[PDB]
Amino acid sequence: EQQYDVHGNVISAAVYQKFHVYGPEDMVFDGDAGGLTIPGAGAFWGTLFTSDLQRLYKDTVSFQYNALGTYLNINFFDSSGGFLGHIQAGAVSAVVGVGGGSGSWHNWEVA
Ligand SMILES: [Co+2]
Ligand SMILES: [Co+2]
């Protein structure tokens, strides 16, 4: 796995969360999750680990997050459940629990 610095944010409505991540090569993750968590908003910093960045960006369709431990973990998956990489980030207090949903990466040409 190669490592990359990333940062992001989350807005929770308790059952729904919107995630953004700003990744290397000027790419942006937009993700829409369900999950059992506290409402609120926060920012995070962390590390993206992936053995194939371009594949992560092309093939990600879904994500899952877990805040039950010491960090915020975000895993990214393809349409066949293949694991494409993950982020280890500092904890955000609006994200307890686990959850997940759809998302994808895009460049600056897409809002
Ligand atoms: Co967005
Ligand atoms: Co979407």
Numbering used by the authors: 87 to 197
Study text:
Members of the virulence-associated protein (Vap) family from the pathogen Rhodococcus equi regulate virulence in an unknown manner. Rhodococcus equi is a Gram-positive facultative intracellular pathogen mainly of young foals, but also of other animal species and of human AIDS patients. VapB and VapA are normally associated with isolates from pigs and horses, respectively. The amino-acid sequence similarities between all Vap proteins according to ClustalW are typically in the 30–50% identity range, with the 78% identity score between VapA and VapB being particularly high.
Here, we present the crystal structure at 1.4 Å resolution of the 12 kDa C-terminal protease-resistant core of recombinantly produced VapB. Edman sequencing (Proteome Factory, Berlin) revealed that the resulting 12 kDa stable fragment started at amino acid Glu85. VapB crystallized in a condition containing 10 mM CoCl2 from a commercial screen. The anomalous signal originating from the S atom of the single methionine and two low-occupancy (∼25%) Co2+ ions was sufficient to solve the phase problem by SAD. Clear electron density is visible for residues Glu87–Val196 with some density for residues Gln86 and Ala197. VapB is an eight-stranded antiparallel β-barrel with a single helix. Unlike other eight- or ten-stranded β-barrels found in avidins, bacterial outer membrane proteins, fatty-acid-binding proteins and lysozyme inhibitors, Vaps do not have a next-neighbour arrangement but consist of two Greek-key motifs with strand order 41238567, suggesting an unusual or even unique topology. The connections between strands 1 and 2 and strands 7 and 8 (residues 99–101 and 181–184, respectively) display double conformations. It is conceivable that these turns/loops move to open a mainly hydrophobic binding site formed by the top of the VapB hydrophobic core. A function of VapB in binding some kind of ligand thus seems possible.
